[PDB]
């Protein structure tokens, strides 16, 4: 569906965030998915690997309690050591490529803190009945 | 689980809608999933393709904001040009096979309008904090 895709990258993170489905809709089907085991086996291998990549990201969102929707609020505070910019500065003057580089150092830390959704689920059961 | 399956098709859409899980539970495992690369390779290829088909439909529901549940309200109005029948007329006198043929012409249009869930998510963030 190259009606629009990574062209979102030409603008700011704020603007790009309004078209997230544009890329999502292009992540599950390569040319081989639209369409002598020699050579042909590679197409089979590629399809399998594409599936695995997709599912790994979905599993991570599941674990974090962010499965479903494009945007997920986490209830985990942002650390002051991760960046030092105005919120509006990053959303209006930075692109996603720039942002990803700027906070690459904290990827594992941030993800580790998203394990807190597990504590939230225990609390919710106790007060839910 | 052929305890019941496509027999739902013998009745109206209304009646059939009460047994949607009956078919869903039969979509992930063929005989080869219950159980010399020559010939046997076909079973491997089939299992992979079945997975891909499943995931593509799930991804579409994800994009539309309809991931989870059998029935999803969209907040997208129905066009008067798509059909001209009483709501009760289609639910009580038509089958799903008949219905699918009747509105086949609008499949892409309807799906394109389900992209509106993206606008809803942006609005929700802005007023959610």
């Amino acid at each position, epitope marked *: 569906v190259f*009606l*629009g895709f990574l*062209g979102a990258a030409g603008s700011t993170m704020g*603007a790009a965030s*309004m*078209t997230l489905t544009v890329q999502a809709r292009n992540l599950l089907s390569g040319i081989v998915q639209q369409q002598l085991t020699v050579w042909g086996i590679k197409q089979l291998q590629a399809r399998v690997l594409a599936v695995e990549r997709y599912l790994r990201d979905q599993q991570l969102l599941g674990i974090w309690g962010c499965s479903g929707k494009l945007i997920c609020c986490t209830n985990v505070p942002w650390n002051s050591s991760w960046s030092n910019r105005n919120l509006s500065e990053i959303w209006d003057n930075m692109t996603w490529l720039q942002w990803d580089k700027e906070i690459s150092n904290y990827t594992q830390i941030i993800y580790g803190l998203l394990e807190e959704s597990q504590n939230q689920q225990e609390k919710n059961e106790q007060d839910l009945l | 689980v052929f305890l019941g399956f496509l027999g739902a098709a013998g009745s109206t859409m209304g009646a059939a809608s009460m047994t949607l899980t009956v078919q869903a539970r039969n979509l992930l495992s063929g005989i080869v999933q219950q159980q010399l690369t020559v010939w046997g390779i076909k079973q491997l290829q089939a299992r992979v393709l079945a997975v891909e088909r499943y995931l593509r439909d799930q991804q579409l529901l994800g994009i539309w904001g309809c991931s989870g549940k059998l029935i999803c309200c969209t907040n997208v109005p129905w066009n008067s040009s798509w059909s001209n029948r009483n709501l009760s007329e289609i639910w009580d006198n038509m089958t799903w096979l008949q219905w699918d043929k009747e509105i086949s012409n609008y499949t892409q249009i309807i799906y*394109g309008l389900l992209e509106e869930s993206q606008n809803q998510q942006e609005k929700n963030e802005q007023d959610l904090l």
Partner: antibody, heavy 125, light 107 residues
Framework: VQLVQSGGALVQPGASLRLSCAAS????????MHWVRQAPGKGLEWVSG???????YYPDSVKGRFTISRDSAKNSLYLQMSSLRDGDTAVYFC????????????????????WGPGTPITISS | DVVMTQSPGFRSVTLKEKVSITCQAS??????LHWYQQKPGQSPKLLIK???QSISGVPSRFSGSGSGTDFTLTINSLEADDAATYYC?????????FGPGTKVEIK
């Protein structure tokens, strides 16, 4: 439905000029808008454009000299040009991008359904 | 860049003649070609989109087709009101480009 345009002008080389268009009976907030120019004896050179999310596009032939902007509150479009040359003499037009075949986000279809009347600019000594 | 040419430079035609002009691209543009017309003193109008799609407001006598590098515009029966310069534009590759146009004169 139309694109209401400003009148023409004569400026000296090196001059700056602002052009504008307005939406009659529609909202600019629902469409991607573009400017083109027609030099005497020529066809329509695309000059600039802005999408529905405020993202922009420019030709290298004007990039750095021309700026496109929108103010949806008043249904108006603007084209601001600096350091104009005699070679930029043309009729300038606004046009409403044609509806795309399938959703793209803020990525234009690059063809037009609605054209304005044309606003000439002459640049000379 | 996609270089577009048109042929003939102009066409001399008479009323009720079935007529045609063509457009060519230096490189394939798939089916992403659109036809426009302009009369002297007038703003441009779009008549055909995506090689062969019709547009409301365009008479049924206008039609066309093409792909790759070769496209054709035709009029089933030429009317006096059809005198215009006709143009092709491509949207396949940025920058968008257009051809020089073909003038159709009616006698």
């Amino acid at each position: 439905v139309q694109l209401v345009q400003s009148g023409g002008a004569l400026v000296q080389p090196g001059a700056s000029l602002r052009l504008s268009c307005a939406a009659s009976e529609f909202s600019f907030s629902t469409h991607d808008m573009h400017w083109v120019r027609q030099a005497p004896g020529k066809g329509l050179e695309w000059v600039s454009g802005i999408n529905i999310h405020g993202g922009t596009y420019y030709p290298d032939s004007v990039k750095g000299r021309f700026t496109i902007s929108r103010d949806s509150a008043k249904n108006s479009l603007y084209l601001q040009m600096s350091s104009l040359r005699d070679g930029d003499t043309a009729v300038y037009f606004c046009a409403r991008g044609g509806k795309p075949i399938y959703y793209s986000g803020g990525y234009p279809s690059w063809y037009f359904d609605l054209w304005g009347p044309g606003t000439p600019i002459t640049i000379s000594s | 860049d996609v270089v577009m040419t048109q042929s003939p430079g102009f066409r001399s035609v008479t009323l009720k003649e079935k007529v045609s002009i063509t457009c060519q691209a230096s490189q394939t543009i798939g089916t992403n070609l659109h036809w426009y017309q302009q009369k002297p003193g007038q703003s441009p109008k779009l008549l055909i989109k995506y090689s062969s799609q019709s547009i409301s407001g365009v008479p049924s006598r206008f039609s066309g087709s093409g792909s790759g590098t070769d496209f054709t515009l035709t009029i089933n029966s030429l009317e006096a009101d059809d005198a215009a310069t006709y143009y092709c534009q491509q949207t396949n590759s940025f920058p968008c480009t257009f051809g020089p146009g073909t003038k159709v004169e009616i006698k």
